[PDB]
Structure 1
Amino acid sequence: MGEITIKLPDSVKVSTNSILYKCGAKDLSVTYYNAGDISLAKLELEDETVVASNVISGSGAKYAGSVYIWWTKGKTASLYNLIDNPEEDKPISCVEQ
C-alpha cells in the first residue's frame, strides 16, 4: 500500500502543508492535513512515524498521536513524549523553517 486514504463524507476541500522544523540538532519533517474541522499532522519522528490529530486546546494547536504531544504556537512548537515526560512540561523546543 504505502498510503492512508480517509474518504470524507462530502466534497470538502483538502489541503496538504509541509514544514521543516529544527528541534535542537535534529530535523523534523511535519506534514499537516486540513479538511475543515479535521486536522492531522504526520510527525516523521526518528523514534517512530506518528500521525497525530488536532485536539482540544486554548492557545496554539495541540496535536495528539501515540504517546506524543505536538504543540504549535506559530513558528515555535514543543515536542512532548509522555513516557519520557509524563508531566507534559519538559518539551523539546522546535523552530519552523
Structure 2
Amino acid sequence: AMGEITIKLPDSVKVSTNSILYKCGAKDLSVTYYNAGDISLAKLELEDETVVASNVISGSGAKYAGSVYIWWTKGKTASLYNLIDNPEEDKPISCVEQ
C-alpha cells in the first residue's frame, strides 16, 4: 500500500533527516535518523527486519529502543542488542560509522 509513515506534529518544529552508514563486522547497515525537537527516531534496515526505534533515556550515548532491539551509539561506535536472542544483553553486535 502506502510505503510511508507520516507522523503529523502539532507545531512548526524543524524536522531533520539524516542517513548514516555503519559497518557491523563484514556487513553494511543503513540507519536513518529523524529529529524533530524532543523527538528522535532511528530506522534501522537490518537484514532480518526493518525497525523503527525511538531515542530513550540513557546516561551516556544515544540509545534507541524498538521491537526486540536496543541500538546504542557512542561517538563513532554502536552496539545492537537483540533481547530475544540475547536477553542477558552481553553479546551485542558491534558496529562503527563508515
* Same fold (TM > 0.5): yes
Structure-1 separation of matches of 2:90 and 2:70: 11
Instruction: After TM superposition, give the deviation of residue 24 of structure 1 in Å.
Output: 0.7
Percent identical residues: 100
User: Structure 1-normalised TM-score?
Assistant: 0.97
Secondary structure of 1:78's counterpart equals strand
Count of aligned positions: 97
Instruction: After TM superposition, give the deviation of residue 74 of structure 1 in Å.
Output: 1.1
Instruction: After TM superposition, give the deviation of residue 89 of structure 1 in Å.
Output: 2.0
Structure-2 separation of matches of 1:33 and 1:74: 18
Structure 1: gaps spanning 5 or more residues:
none
Provide the alpha-carbon RMSD of the alignment: 0.6
For residues 1-59 of structure 1, the C-alpha deviation after alignment (integer angstroms, 9 at most, x for no partner) is: 11100011000000001100000111100000000110000000011100000011000
Structure-1 separation of matches of 2:13 and 2:90: 36
Instruction: After TM superposition, give the deviation of residue 90 of structure 1 in Å.
Output: 1.2
Structure 1 runs of 4+ aligned residues shifted over 2 Å read none
User: Structure 2-normalised TM-score?
Assistant: 0.96
Structure 2: gaps spanning 5 or more residues:
none
Instruction: After TM superposition, give the deviation of residue 86 of structure 1 in Å.
Output: 0.3
Structure-2 separation of matches of 1:76 and 1:57: 16
- The structure that is strand-richer by fraction is 1
